[PDB]
């Protein structure tokens, strides 16, 4: 019922090997819906979900134009960043940008975003107020001064409170079959002997959307979050995600342990045990 739209961008320089690689993707929630890759033969932004395919030719031309212009700006900015950090022209560097908006159940803006990183670290970010900046260092402060002189924050604020929210709302409606449907996890516990003395209980969650989920083991009602191996939530490749949580238990003590599952597609949270 609350939703997000995000555009992610990455430029990576590669001296001696042409112009920087530029890749950008767009998501609504955990659903990919557009992509652009500068290294395709005649690059265009392409659809990746069925509900964006209905946008006409004019939509795809404007997006592609934006993608190509963003690439050229990034190319120049990478050269600029070499001056700001007194760096050599020899190595490969990375420029990332994310921007987008969150909306609440009634479609009003909850939060806007616009932030950059250089070489995997924070560079400059628009603050939640959409009117002021956080620069991470004295280099980013040069960008901040330029952006304050050109009133960039005010311009970003108009996009984020207006078009970002309005287009996110359109997409949520056109894609309501999938975007407004949560698939609950399919769950079970497996049992894996380590030795005669102990065994691993693994609690599984499969086939769920969106990605957000909580998986915990308890032992006679007490959380085990120093003994729980919890893997990162991972894509199945068919829109859904997977996750598991594992605890080592002594032989015979398996019924003291319960697994607890919270996901937005479930009526109530689940409580599971090993069932030989």
């Amino acid at each position: 019922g609350s939703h997000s739209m995000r555009y992610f961008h990455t430029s990576v320089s590669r001296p001696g090997r042409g112009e920087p690689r530029f890749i950008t993707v767009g998501y609504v929630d955990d659903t990919l819906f557009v992509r652009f890759d500068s290294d395709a033969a005649s690059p265009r932004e392409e659809p990746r979900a069925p509900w964006i395919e209905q946008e006409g030719p004019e939509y795809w031309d404007r997006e592609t134009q934006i993608c190509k212009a963003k690439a050229q700006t990034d190319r120049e900015d990478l050269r600029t960043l070499l001056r700001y950090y007194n760096q050599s022209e020899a190595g490969s560097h990375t420029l990332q940008n994310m921007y987008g908006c969150d909306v609440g159940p009634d479609g009003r803006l909850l939060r806007g975003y616009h932030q950059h990183a250089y070489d995997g670290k924070d560079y400059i970010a628009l603050n939640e107020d959409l009117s002021s900046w956080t620069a991470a260092d004295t280099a980013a402060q040069i960008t901040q001064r330029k952006w304050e002189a050109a009133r960039v924050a005010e311009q970003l604020r108009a996009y984020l409170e207006g078009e970002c929210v309005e287009w996110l709302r359109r997409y949520l409606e056109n894609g309501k079959e999938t975007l407004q449907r949560a698939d609950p996890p399919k769950t079970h516990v497996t049992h894996h002997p380590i030795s005669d003395h102990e065994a691993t209980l693994r609690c599984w969650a499969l086939g769920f959307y969106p990605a957000e989920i909580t998986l915990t083991w308890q032992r006679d009602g007490e959380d085990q979050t120093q003994d729980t191996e919890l893997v990162e939530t991972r894509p199945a490749g068919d829109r859904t995600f997977q996750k598991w949580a594992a605890v080592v238990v002594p032989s015979g003590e398996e019924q003291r342990y319960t697994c607890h599952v919270q996901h937005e597609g479930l009526p109530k949270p689940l409580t599971l045990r090993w069932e030989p």
């Binding site: 767009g26 934006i66 700006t73 900015d77 330029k146 078009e163």
Partner: peptide, 9 residues
Amino acid sequence: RRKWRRWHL
């Protein structure tokens, strides 16, 4: 859809 405007670092 994407924003039209952008600004150099």
